[PDB]
């Protein structure tokens, strides 16, 4: 009965990761409310028959992708020290989209086919995005140190 019975049980899911996709509570609150107002005139653009959560994420990222495409937004950030800054202070070098593929295949168990529809790529591209994501994880998990060295010489100096 009505959209509310398919909106309310997934309403906070837009902040469940929006809190780390813009790094501001003022941006996260206005994105979810702007996502709904963008459907008050086009409720046919917000289906849920595919999955009860795949439609929620498509409309929320639509407002976010329109914001950084006009300067109304910038790169993400944090305001904590152990629940969102942990996902920044250890991954400050992962590309702006492999981090979305990570929360889409290590936190939701969804297939790579609908995960590819959630970032508008092919199924095989999501497989590559998660392969590079887990490679940067196993390599350091906190980037505590670095060593680009590995060779030397003694006949030119």
């Amino acid at each position: 009965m009505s959209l509310g019975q398919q909106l309310a049980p997934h309403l906070p899911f837009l902040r469940r990761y929006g809190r780390a996709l813009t790094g501001s509570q003022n941006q996260g609150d206005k994105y979810v409310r702007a996502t709904l107002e963008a459907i008050v005139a086009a409720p046919d653009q917000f289906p849920r028959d595919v999955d009860p959560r795949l439609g929620l994420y498509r409309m929320f990222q639509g407002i976010w992708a329109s914001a950084n495409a006009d300067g109304e937004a910038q790169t993400s950030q944090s305001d904590a020290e152990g629940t969102e800054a942990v996902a920044r202070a250890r991954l400050a070098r992962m590309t702006p989209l492999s981090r979305q593929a990570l929360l889409l295949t290590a936190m939701e168990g969804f297939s790579p086919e609908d995960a590819a529809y959630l970032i508008e790529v092919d199924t095989s591209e999501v497989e590559t995005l998660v392969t590079e994501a887990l490679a940067e994880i196993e390599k350091q998990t906190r980037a505590l140190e670095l060593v680009p060295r590995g060779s030397h010489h003694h006949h030119h100096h």
């Binding site: 509310g4 409310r33 629940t83 996902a87 936190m107």
Partner: protein
């Protein structure tokens, strides 16, 4: 001169199988999930569904 069938094949089984999601991304998936599960162990707004109280839940007396 004619011919006839005598064999067949398939490419499906109308069935499904289990999986695993803790041996492909290790405990790192549960680390991120737990940090944001806390984000769901709390209340939710309702002003967004109040935007529907003007197109899918209106009412008038008499």
């Amino acid at each position: 001169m004619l011919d006839l069938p005598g064999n067949k094949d398939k490419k499906a089984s109308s069935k499904k199988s289990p999986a695993k999601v803790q041996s492909k991304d290790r405990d790192m998936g549960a680390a991120l999930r737990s940090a944001y599960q806390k984000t769901i162990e709390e209340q939710v707004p309702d002003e967004m569904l109040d935007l529907l109280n003007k197109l899918a839940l209106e009412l008038v007396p008499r």
